[PDB]
Amino acid sequence: NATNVKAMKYLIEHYFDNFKVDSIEIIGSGYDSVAYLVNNEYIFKTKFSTNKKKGYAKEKAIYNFLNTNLETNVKIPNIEYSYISDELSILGYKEIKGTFLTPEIYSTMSEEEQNLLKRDIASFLRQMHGLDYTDISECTIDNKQNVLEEYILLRETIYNDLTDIEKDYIESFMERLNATTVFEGKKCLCHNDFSCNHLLLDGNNRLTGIIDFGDSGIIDEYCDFIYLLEDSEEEIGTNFGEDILRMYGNIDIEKAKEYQDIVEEYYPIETIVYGIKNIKQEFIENGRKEIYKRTYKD
Ligand SMILES: Nc1nc2c(ncn2[C@@H]2O[C@H](COP(=O)(O)OP(=O)(O)O)[C@@H](O)[C@H]2O)c(=O)[nH]1
Ligand SMILES: [Cl-]
Ligand SMILES: [Mg+2]
Ligand SMILES: [Mg+2]
User: Fold this and answer.
1) Which residues lie with the beta carbon below 6 Å from any ligand 1 atom?
2) Which of 101, 200, 213, 272 could join 196 in a cystine, given CB atoms 3.0 to 4.6 angstroms apart?
3) 211, 215, 216, 274: residue to mutate for ligand 1 pocket, most atoms within 8 A of CB
4) Which of 213, 82, 249 is nearest to 136 (CA)?
5) How far apart are CA 210 and CA 150, in angstroms?
6) In degrees rounded to 5, what are phi and psi of residue 87?
């Protein structure tokens, strides 16, 4: 699958006059994006037509805001090339180098190395969350309202074809969402996809870089702890997130956990909604199945 590499080479050279592509390979991808390593130096992140028709616009505005206002040794993407349209968007920045944090690597770190990493993370988040965001005040994200809208989308599309069990899982979520107070806390600029696969380590196992601020915005402070608190094979574990919360300070840990638990409870619904919005039946099917699996866990 080389048609897309060649296509991307052409597009890069076409949209960015005087950029020459000597080498190009795919080095990663997201749900709707592919990331290309170009000349062993640049990342070119690309998306074709999607629901976020101004998505890379926002992401770029965020990198610009952060590179202007953050004071940190931690690297983030600094945008040098951009092309943005309904049908195609491209962000180009110098590759952030290092090794992605994994549970395996963490477990080979000394206790001190682990603490320092935790400190590095706490300190970064503290700095970002503390930025006055009045300048990008429009990049607000209201997760509660979004779920409400997504629920309405469900009601308008497939809800009536759902089973009672599926419906009950959804309504039960909605009821919990209506009762929770976890949205009524501090709002601030968050990375909002803060998992260990976006965290880069240098050769001393210290945090050297953070990527993918594609979902960032002004949102509940709790958001950036959701994956740090996650107990799964992909993430490091709850104790890791707890310790980081303590280092970060001034934050209700139980509430951060409740927030994580609610996001986790929503995931199958999110999956279904993605399936609907992007016309991908496989995602609707997986989300529904996942509801059954969780209903039967107990
Ligand atoms: N090492 C490294 N990998 C990157 C960099 N930028 C992107 N990637 C890889 O490309 C993937 C997709 O980038 P990302 O912004 O996460 O895409 P999104 O998940 O679609 O928003 C990431 O998960 C990484 O694997 C970078 O600057 N350094
Ligand atoms: Cl289905
Ligand atoms: Mg990503
Ligand atoms: Mg992203």
Assistant:
1) 27-30, 33, 35, 43, 45, 95-96, 197, 211-212, 214
2) 101
3) 211
4) 213
5) 29
6) -90, -20
**Is 17 part of any known ligand binding site?**
no
- Of 94, 120, 155, the position where a domain reaches its end is 94
Cβ–Cβ < 8 Å for 61, 208: no
Q: Is 168 a catalytic residue?
A: no
Resolution (A): 2.3
In terms of domains, do 241 and 121 share one?
Answer: yes
Ligand 1, atom 22: closest residue by C-alpha: 28
Catalytic residue among 17, 32, 142, 193: 193
Q: How far apart are CA 224 and CA 117, in angstroms?
A: 16
Among 36, 70, 94, the domain-final residue is 94
210 Cβ partners below 8 Å, 6+ apart?
74, 75, 76, 96, 124, 191, 198, 199, 200
